């Protein structure tokens, strides 16, 4: 996808699905009132986030794109787990092995390769800068 394809809601609404594989046009007030759709398919998909990442790159914003790529992986991580991982990246909360185990969980359970690498990098530099538990 390029900047010509932006915005998706106007150029390609048929390209946007939901985390329960419903299309975008299903989001009419009729389907809401019948409980034919409810809160959980109101969740952005990793495919959508990777399309925006591609568009961010075409617009010359590599870092924004990488943020979107991390976001695409984290759609698979439950709400409570997200907050647990965030809290553990805070200084003096974790040892180095705990952070490495967190990245292991991210990779092996949620296919979150970019977020795992990001967490392992943190673990390495928290050693260098003494931001680990017990420091």
């Amino acid at each position: 996808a390029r900047v010509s394809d932006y915005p998706l809601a106007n150029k390609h609404p048929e390209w946007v699905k939901t985390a329960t594989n419903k299309t975008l046009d299903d989001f009419t007030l009729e389907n809401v009132l019948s409980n034919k759709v409810t809160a959980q398919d109101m969740r952005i998909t990793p495919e959508t986030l990777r399309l925006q990442a591609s568009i961010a790159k075409d617009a010359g914003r590599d870092r924004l794109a990488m943020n979107f790529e991390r976001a695409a992986e984290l759609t698979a991580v439950p709400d409570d787990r997200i907050l647990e991982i965030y809290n553990a990246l805070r200084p003096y909360r974790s040892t180095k092995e705990e952070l490495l185990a967190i990245a292991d969980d991210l990779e092996s359970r949620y296919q979150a390769k970019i977020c795992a690498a990001f967490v392992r990098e943190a673990a390495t530099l928290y050693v260098e800068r003494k931001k680990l538990k017990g420091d």
């Binding site: 900047v3 932006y6 915005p7 998706l8 809601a9 106007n10 609404p13 946007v16 939901t18 975008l24 989001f27 009419t28 007030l29 809401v32 009132l33 759709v37 409810t38 809160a39 109101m42 969740r43 952005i44 959508t48 986030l49 925006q52 568009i55 961010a56 617009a59 010359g60 914003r61 870092r63 924004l64 794109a65 990488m66 943020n67 979107f68 991390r70 976001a71 695409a72 992986e73 984290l74 759609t75 991580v77 709400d79 997200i82 907050l83 991982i85 965030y86 809290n87 990246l89 805070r90 200084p91 977020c115 990001f118 967490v119 990098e121 943190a122 530099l125 928290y126 800068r129 931001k131």
Partner: protein, 553 residues
């Protein structure tokens, strides 16, 4: 005897402000400090080995984050070798396009870009800002709060704010557990005044994200970053925990930005002898390095620190310019009181108002300042007419418009009624027709009947405790007779699914049409180019109240 001239001067409001002389050694200096590091970078392939005089073995977590993620390494060594005065010249030269500059400015180190803008006066910084701002059209963000967390008033104030032209609106609470009602009332009220307005509820960082997973907010902003490792650690965070939290918001389809601002580090007493502008640049590169699309900066709540020292307000403009030059959306503060003097706060406002930023204020108070739960903004609701007159005087689009009283009465009334049906359709404590009337004609919370806070608190908690989501709000509107408001609410949630508005400077205008720095690129190239106030927009800003028609004169 005492001079009666100096007695009269001693009674002036400006002399109640706080001023101090510079303390260079401790970093109590806005900019241009002799302690700031000389620009330097060592590259070739892969990674950085020296950043602004610091070797890689000496990097703190911030140097690492910036060195690995924050600099366009493709051109760093070329732009490091360019003369800083020439680079400043290009910034304000109308014939060097924004798209030619961004590769170079993103390639400078923090000390390089600080050195470059330090050669500029405020006229030059303003000239550069109107080119470097990411979104072509400027906009505005408002605070919508009241001292009682009265949800009916928040909805009506949000509708008026949206009708005046605010494209983002922000709320917070006096009482912590009121927050779910504030978020819902702000969101409903905003969509009534103009569908597409984005809403946030600023809370502690974990509680804010939970409200966003429920669908009651659109964006988040108060995630703070800091410019020295000690201050960042004393904030109980690292760049990696902030970056992970940033991608967490995007993963839930929520636009977000960081907040920083000059003066935060010296206030904590750990500026490491550096100037406020140098430390703020570090914050801006942290934001860029995290992949966050924009930043709320311009000292913000620390404004009393740079405004006390020489060149402090110029420095605040400089940090807004650095933010935009780094291709980030800039929400340029003007959201906190700092002076007793109307002249002084006007001059500070004008720095961003005249060129335009992505959000001229990141918190214009849409309520009287006594109701402002961020402890007061640089502008409040009683300045609306002045703000509109200056727009008309200078032919400057400052994001707002004049409005008719009966239109505002009609839109506040509808917003109050819309929220009354939401509270009915979700089983929340009732909104009486008396509260609807009062919020229709109120100026602030002084005009509103008191509510049962203890009962309101209990039901608002039960909204997060039971994971009651934004689609229940849509249903209640559809069923209380507000199917037009219900569809707009569904369009807002549908925008979260597309991710279009996660992009730089994104707002939603017209009928669900996203407007961001991707499709509304700033293309300024001098006079008669870029954004010009003209056409029907100009006619709207022209039509201020009190403008007598010659045919009735």
């Amino acid at each position: 005897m005492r001079s009666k001239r100096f007695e009269a001067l001693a009674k002036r409001p400006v002399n109640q402000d706080g001023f101090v002389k510079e303390w260079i050694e401790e970093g109590f200096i806005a900019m241009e400090s002799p302690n700031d590091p000389k620009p330097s970078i060592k590259i070739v392939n892969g990674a950085v080995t020296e950043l602004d005089g610091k070797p890689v073995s000496d990097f703190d977590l911030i140097d690492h984050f910036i060195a690995r993620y924050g600099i366009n390494l493709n051109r760093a060594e070329e732009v490091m070798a360019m003369d800083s005065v020439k680079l400043a010249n290009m910034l304000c030269d109308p014939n060097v396009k924004r798209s030619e500059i961004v590769p170079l400015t993103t390639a400078m180190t923090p000390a390089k870009i600080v050195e470059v803008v330090s050669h500029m006066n405020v006229v030059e910084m303003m000239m550069a800002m109107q080119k470097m701002r990411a979104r072509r059209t400027p906009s505005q963000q408002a605070h919508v709060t009241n001292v009682k967390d009265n949800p009916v008033q928040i909805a009506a104030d949000a509708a008026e704010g949206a009708w005046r032209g605010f494209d983002e609106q922000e709320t917070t609470v006096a009482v912590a557990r009121y927050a779910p009602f504030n978020a819902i009332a702000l969101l409903v009220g905003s969509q009534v005044g103009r569908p597409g307005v984005l809403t946030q509820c600023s809370l502690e960082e974990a509680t804010e994200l939970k409200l966003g997973m429920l669908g009651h907010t659109c964006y988040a902003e108060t995630i703070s970053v800091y410019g020295t490792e000690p201050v960042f650690t004393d904030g109980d965070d690292t760049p990696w925990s902030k970056g992970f939290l940033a991608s967490s918001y995007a993963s839930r389809g929520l636009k977000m930005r960081f907040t920083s601002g000059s003066g935060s580090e010296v206030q904590m007493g750990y500026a490491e002898g550096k100037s406020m502008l140098y430390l703020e640049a570090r914050c801006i590169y942290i934001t860029k390095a995290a992949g966050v699309q924009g930043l709320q900066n311009g000292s913000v709540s620390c404004i009393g620190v740079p405004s006390a020292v020489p060149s402090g307000i110029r420095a605040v403009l400089a940090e807004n310019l650095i933010c935009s030059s780094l291709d980030l959306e800039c929400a340029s503060s003007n959201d906190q009181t700092f002076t007793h003097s109307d002249m002084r706060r006007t001059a500070r406002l004008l720095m961003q108002f005249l060129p335009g930023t992505d959000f001229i204020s990141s918190g214009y108070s849409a309520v009287p300042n006594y109701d402002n739960m961020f402890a007061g903004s640089n502008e409040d609701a009683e300045d609306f007419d002045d703000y509109n007159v200056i727009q008309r005087d200078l032919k400057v689009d400052g994001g707002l418009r004049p409005v008719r009283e009966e239109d505002v009465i009609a839109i506040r009334n509808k917003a109050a009624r819309a929220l009354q049906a939401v509270f009915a359709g979700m089983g929340l404590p009732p909104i009486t027709d008396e509260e609807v009337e009062a919020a229709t004609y109120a100026h602030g919370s002084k005009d509103m009947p008191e509510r049962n806070i203890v009962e309101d608190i209990k039901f608002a908690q039960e909204i997060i405790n039971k994971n009651r989501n934004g689609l229940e709000v849509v249903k209640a509107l559809a069923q209380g007779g507000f199917t037009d408001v219900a569809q707009d609410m569904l369009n807002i949630q549908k925008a979260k699914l597309t991710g279009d508005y996660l992009h730089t400077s994104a707002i939603i205008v017209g009928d669900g049409q996203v407007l961001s720095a991707v499709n509304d690129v700033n293309d300024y190239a001098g006079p008669a180019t870029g954004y010009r106030l003209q056409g029907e927009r100009w006619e709207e800003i022209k039509n201020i109240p009190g403008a007598l028609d010659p045919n009735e004169d």
